[PDB]
Paper text:
The electroneutral K+-Cl− cotransporters (KCCs) play fundamental roles in trans-epithelial transport, cell volume regulation, and neuronal excitability. Here, we present single particle cryo-electron microscopy (cryo-EM) structures of the full-length human KCC2 and KCC3 at overall resolution of 3.2 and 3.3 Å, respectively. The structures of KCC2 and KCC3 are very similar to each other.
The TM domain and CTD are connected through a pair of scissor helices, which separate the two TM domains from different protomers resulting in a unique “Central Cleft” between TM domains at the cytosolic side. The extracellular domain (ECD) of the two protomers are placed in distance. A marked difference is observed in the C-terminal domain (CTD) compared with Danio rerio Na+-K+ Cl− cotransporter 1 (DrNKCC1), which rotates ~70° clockwise as seen from cytosolic side when transmembrane (TM) domains aligned together. A unique “L” shape N-terminal loop (residues N100–N120) is bound to the entry of the cytosolic vestibule of the transporter, which can be divided into an N lobe and a C lobe. The C lobe, which extends along TM8 and approaches CTD, is stabilized through salt bridges E116-K549 and E119-R886, as well as hydrophilic interaction between H115 and F203 from IL23.
Author numbering:
A (entry chain B), B (entry chain A): 100 to 120, 133 to 972, 994 to 1000, 1030 to 1099
The structure:
């Protein structure tokens, strides 16, 4: 009996900072979520929701509203099993899993939702006070005339504000005493639901005998009358009753002069509660939507027809109803599911208790609502259900007459259950606004975090006593209920959206480790919160989705100013960092290669660009899309030449826009040229957005003399590039390359494919041909095969491969001896299966294994060294078959062989590359990195 | 007379590729925009829009719709004066200024809008054929009964499809002949508008005398009758007329038996067109909304009251109307403003002709519409206006009876003006879909670019003949017109939004050089297109805004796969590049500093991190927000140690997540340690997102012996950092710094502010105190002043400065002689006004010039060298006043002096820093870069 610390209230602040310096599933998450869902609609308005619209349509109102908040409880459960479940309640659990910017626009839509909920229970409690307890202490009891609902809304205003100012005084003084009495308010709800189920089984054996007077197809107000037969015999003195005096002039006048409907259509008396035995459910299955001011009447009765006059004794339809109006009245029942996580600081295992405690509390209350819809339409008369305030049963609760001990067990029971749910919302709403006043995410809400000596917000209570006071001057509980259901549907939408939006775009710290969670359930439960929001008002849903969007972008602007200094510039800095951090986790090793480029520009003396045509050819290859980095090296000391490094970056960036290159500049000052180039190749980019291919020019003038520095810098750059596993594009005779405004009228582009790098040698003429300059050229492809292979099948297969990819080229094979391509065919099968050992890695069927050009070509099958039965790697037989067909061809692409395994062959390697490209105008040498698989040619 | 190449048609493709290998304002932009705006609503339906709803509300329908498309013509004009105005029409002018992804969802909403416009003119042309020309060649002329509109919709289906299949055959064969006759269709519209203004001035002197028969407060169908007096005297043989035979049984029966309304309520005859003279405008100022099936009747007539029976001779209200229905019917009038730019390939100055030609064509047609609303309600009888098909005026056009020569000048004139506007939309819609089939932005629309030998799309015409054919089977012109106004409002919304969205976020290539353009005009004209879209249907506006949004994200996904290889990974690569390119243009030199950080980690042998506590202190300073780069250097050769560089990056990144650091790793292999460190300081980042502050550890053990390398690497790093104008944070005794889980219970943080770097020395304890570890400490600030300054005013002013910023520290001043702070006070006024020469730069009042701590402190006012009347820079008097107050203080922040101007003083500089920080546990030495102004302390 020592578990008296039940405390269904909210955690909030002052219990979050103490955790930065137990309970179970039943007493911690299940029971606080059960107490905050049951409210006033189950007692005051559920009989009116079944009576209007019948059983078959009130079953669809509850089932739509309960499945809307069930699918939100799965997204709310996936939040609790993602992080490390911080201890502050529901605001701190969302603002760390969904980050900021969904703390606001969820915490602010939750603060307005519970502030108008506190004005709804107070308006609900005065209605149980002015009716059903003391219908004698009204203030504005005007005379009986055509207006009395306007005289009822004035009594709710003067008693409502006097009831709000007394509950605010309780929370400001005795908040430790509203916390100890949380188990007393829970006992008033459980014994009231059991009192309804007791009497609905009793009524199958003994109905409670509540009578109602009917004039015949018209229902009369049972108050102000005594007998139900219009005769009122005392003893053989037949003075007519009070019922005669309302329809006629006065008594003692059995002659004549009464109304037309009264002289026919006899006065009878039927049963108000026939019980579960007699099948009255066949009359309550159908709808009864009527306009305001009509008469509540039943079928299976008797009525002449002679029209009559309206009297102040019938029962009247109070408001005009529809299907869309009853959804907004019933929806504050199912709200309250965020009360499963408001005791997150005391659970022993708060990640397996919160999902199973919230979901099982939804099935409990949705079973009480769905079973009471059937058990009201099958026990109570249709004319007793189709009116509020119970004027046909002498002024009782319609749900109260069904109960077994008394009607007073629900009247006095749902009065403390209503005042208890109002004190909870009036103390959990200032504890939420005090939390958003912390963390400094909204700067003009800074004054509302002004805690006393122990928690207990001061100025946050004065707004909640002033916005709920605006919900009191609006009387009429049927009007305040569609207002607060717009706010709770607004915060259920953003939780369901942000959970599905983060598991699709692969947000970095989001792994919802939880069974029975998918991205489709948070999306199916997002379309239902949008459907119920539009059919309510549609002009208070559009304007409540933009101020929940204008408060979204205000947090991101203010959150970037405190992070990156200023405002608008910080928005682009935070969007670039978040996109870069997402790039680190995806299985790299992509299977659609694309060149990125790193253009190495040589600067001479006077700090000018030596080959400005390299930026022009880099622009024609990329055509303005993708990443392009331009790198340069100034030889000198940085402590003296730092002013010359800033001026040299301006002339490169000015040349960069004259050649239409979209990219970045990267200049460095090094002591040696070979060291500064080697550092630019391995340290450019910011992770993920790094380069892929190095592009440099040919060293024109290496055969000069006395200067091993000019050509050993080139071989050193090739060796660094092939060690970092990058591609290499070397352009020879770059000064004869075309400008951006010259446009070759006709010509060829010849590709000499030699055993290796097949995919890269077909993508590069394809990307170049979709430019203004190289548009009218045509692609010719020459493949070098050997005598042992099948040249007939290789020609028939490469032509079949280009047909399925829409390339529009022509293929011709040429066979050469093994003593002529020995620089290429030597290191094959050391590295060829090394490409096979890497080919698999990921998944790839045969519809994509027949799109790689190297794989479709590979259906085939005395020493030779680089240094001086030992012969040198010659190229005089390979060049004369290239220049025999590829002269006057405007561009020649051919793959270059690798450098030797050791030095003492570097000058023989430069002489191999000089006699290979002898007699061609524009040559582009290609070297593959090793890992380049291309399956889609744009 | 040689200007016969008028050609109001669309440019499209085949005239865009020819410009990659004149006309004026009147004949090029003004007149083609004037011909495509005037249509069928001005002739067939404008009299019905004035008759219903009166003059005062039909004036508000035109003024709302014309100002909606005027504000779009300003955003469309700002597009044409931004780029270099490409030559392809309106699709190529938008898809280059707004980029891609607004080419689609604007070009696709424009293609559907003109396809349903071609079904509207064809349905409009059959109505001028079946009525008003030959009401004898119908097919489904059913018997006169309660349904005849259903017998009218079947005649529009079988003649509509036979008229669509003949105009498709014209465009496929004779598109050069529909282009030459563009001036002939323009002449049929201009002489028809002048024929209306001629007769409306003639009617002030001589009305055209069109009579209409009235039974008295009831309007009769004037066809099928001959006389209007129900007597029909031939010669003294009073046989009753045809009017008697419709209401009674038959003729020759002057006795009795006719209806109740016919025996009273005499037959009269009023004027159909009284003219501009008699003030009939006082009866047409007000609304006449009526349900379907009511009788058109006028006030100021005579009617008994005796109800009657409905006859097949009255005129009936055909459809039920509202205010929102008439907006969707009138709105296809003002559409067509994109026809100003469809001749952009032939204008001589296409940037000053398109804005002044489009805007002046809007004022012309909006003057014809606004003046004809007043000139119809003041000339024509209200019962002739309030019906279509003209059955009260013997079957004429209601606009035709007002004209001066004949009613036939409008009937035969608006038949060729309607067929001419239908052939234009049936040839400009396949030319648009053929353009979006090019550029490969949508891959499953690839088959519809299948041009013949000269342009002329084949398969694109077969969709336009199949979607407009779906608009023919839907008959009833009043229903097709709200469908196409939903598409034209959908593409006017995206042009107005993207013009205002790009001039707010500062998109790089967007400078709309044009007078009278603001971002507020494109936003005011965006709320009007949203207002007219929601009041039309609201369930065909929400579903037409998501499929225009699902086609938005499909282009960005497909546009990133062809750019970055694969799909989802490419979306983050393109978002990071676009955010980085926006960062290059904004005036740098921000005025709210924030440390970015570059942590230099020393690796020893075995390739481990020597000081792993530097990553922990870097995490406590940044707290997970901002950019943090970790840099390391491996000493060796990259061609051998490239496998060890990949493994060393894994252990750094694994240590990086154990200390909760969000950032990037950057490791390099250099030959020397000093060269690789110097390159990391000047070449990290990618432009804009670069570092701001270098953080390194103190060289513990430099006083060892034989190893000038350990401490000259430190002074070299300080000299490189102060030459690149960066800040420096040196941490001494980093192994005694706290971990992330230890949390000092109480203590101080002492800041020793010495003459310089005032703003940085107050931000760093503020950012450190908002962490878990340094939360409970308190900040003490010691400022060093001189004897000549005012210590009393400096104490009173620094305490006033911290009050207005919410810092919660305490300030105490200490005065020292000039022979003790000589290492600090020496190079002041060489660099102090250099800070003043940079202070201004941007704008800054006094409310922010009193928030910089160095500026509020500056209200104040024998040789000493670094090498050996010449004394050394000593620190034995400065240290004993720091250690007298800042021992047991848990952190000491003090600014360090600069290195000497030359070497031969480097070892005296390391000995100055050793005796300065003698006897303190944790010291952090701060050095300002020179350009650090802080005005907002978070
Ligand atoms: C209730 O009203 C009905 C008629 O509205 C009365 O029914 C009549 O009863 C008498 C007596 O048996 C019959 O002769 C008549 O034929 C009934 N009328 C009809 C239309 O069937 C009945 O009397 C009224 N009830 C009372 C108690 O007076
Ligand atoms: C209550 O009585 C009224 C009138 O006596 C009923 O309305 C009549 O319904 C019948 C169809 O059964 C119509 O033919 C009459 O024209 C209606 N009369 C009037 C005046 O409306 C009404 O149906 C009765 N209520 C119920 C629930 O049956
Ligand atoms: C038109 O109808 C009106 C009544 O609806 C007829 O007006 C009557 O005319 C006679 C002849 O002067 C008067 O004595 C009556 O007083 C008029 N009636 C009223 C109510 O004022 C009129 O005769 C009809 N027109 C014709 C041509 O017969
Ligand atoms: C056409 O005639 C009808 C009936 O004669 C007019 O309707 C009457 O309007 C008066 C108000 O002036 C009412 O008091 C009557 O009750 C109405 N009678 C009916 C049967 O509706 C109607 O106003 C006339 N039309 C116009 C334009 O005045
Ligand atoms: C009337 O009632 C009284 C008492 O109920 C009785 O004494 C008297 O006899 C009755 N009269 C008749 C005529 O029944
Ligand atoms: C009531 O009785 C009086 C007196 O005969 C009579 O004048 C009056 O009209 C009656 N009331 C009604 C409503 O008929
Ligand atoms: C009737 O009309 C005819 C010709 O209009 C005329 O000759 C005859 O006299 C008329 N009769 C009377 C009675 O007016
Ligand atoms: C027309 O006349 C015939 C013959 O007298 C009569 O039976 C019939 O009812 C009349 N028509 C009407 C509509 O009264
Ligand atoms: Cl409730
Ligand atoms: Cl909730
Ligand atoms: Cl039109
Ligand atoms: Cl348009």
């Amino acid at each position: 009996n020592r578990m008296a610390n039940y405390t269904n209230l909210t955690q909030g602040a002052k219990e979050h900072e103490e955790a930065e310096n137990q309970m179970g599933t039943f007493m911690g998450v299940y029971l606080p979520c059960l107490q905050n869902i049951f409210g006033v609609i189950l007692f005051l308005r559920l009989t009116w929701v079944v009576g209007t619209a019948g059983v078959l349509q009130a079953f669809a109102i509850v089932l739509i509203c309960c499945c809307c908040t069930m699918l939100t409880a799965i997204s709310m459960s996936a939040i609790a099993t993602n992080g490390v479940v911080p201890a502050g309640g529901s605001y701190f659990m969302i603002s760390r899993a969904l980050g900021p910017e969904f703390g606001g626009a969820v915490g602010l839509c939750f603060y307005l939702g519970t502030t108008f909920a506190a004005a709804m229970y107070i308006l609900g409690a005065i209605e149980i006070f002015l009716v059903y307890i003391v219908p004698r202490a009204a203030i504005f009891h005007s005379d009986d005339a055509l207006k009395e609902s306007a005289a009822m809304l004035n009594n709710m205003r003067v008693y409502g504000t006097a009831f709000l100012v007394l509950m605010v005084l309780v929370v400001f003084i005795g908040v430790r005493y509203v916390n100890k009495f949380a188990s007393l308010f829970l006992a008033c709800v459980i014994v009231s639901i059991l009192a309804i189920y007791a009497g609905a089984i009793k009524s199958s054996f003994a109905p409670p005998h509540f009578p109602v007077c009917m004039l015949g197809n018209r229902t009369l107000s049972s108050r102000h009358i005594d007998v139900c037969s219009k005769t009122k015999e005392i003893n053989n003195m037949t003075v007519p009753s009070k019922l005669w005096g309302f329809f006629c002039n006065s008594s003692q006048f059995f002659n004549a002069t009464c109304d037309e409907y009264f002289v026919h259509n006899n006065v009878t008396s039927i049963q108000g509660i026939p019980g579960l035995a007699s099948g009255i459910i066949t009359e309550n299955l159908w709808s009864n939507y009527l306009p305001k001011g009509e008469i509540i009447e039943k079928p299976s009765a008797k009525s002449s027809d002679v029209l009559g006059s309206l009297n102040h004794e019938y029962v009247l339809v109070d408001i005009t109803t529809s299907f869309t109006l009853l959804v907004g009245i019933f929806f504050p029942s199912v709200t309250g599911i965020m009360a499963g996580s408001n005791r997150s600081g005391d659970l022993k295992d708060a990640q397996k208790s919160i999902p199973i405690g919230t979901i099982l509390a939804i099935l409990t209350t949705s079973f009480v609502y769905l079973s009471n819809v059937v058990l009201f339409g099958a026990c109570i008369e249709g004319v007793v259900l189709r009116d509020k305030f119970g004027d046909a049963v002498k002024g009782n609760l319609v749900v109260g007459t069904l109960s077994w001990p008394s009607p007073w067990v629900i009247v006095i029971g749902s009065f403390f259950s209503t005042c208890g749910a109002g004190l909870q919302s009036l103390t959990g709403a200032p504890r939420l606004l005090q939390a958003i006043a912390k963390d400094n995410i909204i700067p003009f809400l800074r004054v509302f975090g002004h805690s006393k000596a122990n928690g207990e917000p001061t100025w946050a209570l004065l707004l909640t006593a002033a916005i709920a006071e605006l919900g009191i001057l609006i009387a009429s509980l049927d009007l305040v209920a569609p207002i607060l259901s717009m706010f709770f549907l607004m915060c259920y939408l953003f939780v369901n959206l942000a959970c599905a939006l983060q598991t699709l775009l692969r947000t970095p710290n989001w792994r919802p480790r939880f069974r029975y969670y998918h991205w489709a359930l948070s999306f199916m439960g997002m379309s239902i919160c949008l459907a119920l929001m539009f059919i309510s008002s549609w002009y208070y849903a559009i304007v409540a989705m933009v101020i929940a969007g204008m408060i979204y972008k205000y947090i991101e602007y203010q959150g970037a100013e405190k992070e990156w200094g200023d405002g608008i510039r910080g928005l682009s800095l935070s969007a670039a960092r978040f996109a870069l951090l997402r790039l680190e986790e995806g299985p790299p090793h992509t299977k659609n290669w694309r060149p990125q480029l790193l253009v190495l520009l040589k600067l001479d003396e006077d700090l000018h660009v030596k080959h400005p045509r390299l930026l022009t050819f880099a622009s024609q290859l990329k055509a303005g899309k993708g990443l392009t980095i331009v790198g340069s090296v100034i030889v000198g000391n940085f402590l003296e030449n730092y002013g010359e490094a800033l001026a040299a970056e301006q002339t490169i960036k000015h040349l960069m826009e004259a050649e239409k290159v979209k990219g970045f500049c990267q200049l460095v000052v090094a002591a040696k040229l070979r060291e500064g180039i080697s550092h630019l190749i391995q340290s450019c980019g910011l992770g993920g957005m790094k380069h892929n291919t190095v592009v440099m020019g040919w060293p024109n003038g290496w055969r000069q003399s006395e200067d091993a520095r000019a050509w050993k810098t080139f071989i050193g750059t090739v060796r660094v590039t092939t060690a970092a596993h990058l591609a290499l594009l070397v352009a020879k005779n770059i000064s004869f390359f075309p400008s951006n405004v010259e446009q070759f009228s006709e010509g060829n582009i010849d590709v000499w494919w030699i055993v290796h790098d097949g995919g890269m040698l077909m993508l590069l003429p394809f990307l170049l041909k979709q430019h203004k300059v190289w548009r009218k050229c045509s692609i010719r492809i020459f493949t070098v095969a050997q005598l042992e292979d099948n040249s007939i099948q290789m020609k028939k297969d490469l032509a079949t491969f280009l047909y399925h990819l829409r390339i529009e080229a022509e293929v011709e094979v040429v066979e050469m001896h093994d003593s002529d391509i020995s620089a290429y065919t030597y290191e094959r099968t050391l590295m060829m299966e090394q490409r096979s050992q890497m080919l698999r890695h990921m998944r790839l069927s045969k519809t994509e294994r027949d799109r790689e050009a190297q794989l479709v070509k590979d259906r085939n099958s005395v020493h030779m060294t680089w240094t001086k039965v030992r012969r040198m790697h010659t190229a005089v037989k390979l060049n004369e078959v290239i220049v025999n067909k590829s002269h006057e061809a405007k561009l020649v692409l051919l793959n270059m062989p690798g450098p030797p395994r050791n030095p003492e062959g570097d000058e023989n390697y430069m002489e191999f590359l000089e006699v290979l490209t002898e007699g061609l105008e524009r040559v582009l040498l290609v070297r593959g990195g090793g890992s380049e698989v291309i399956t889609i040619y744009s």
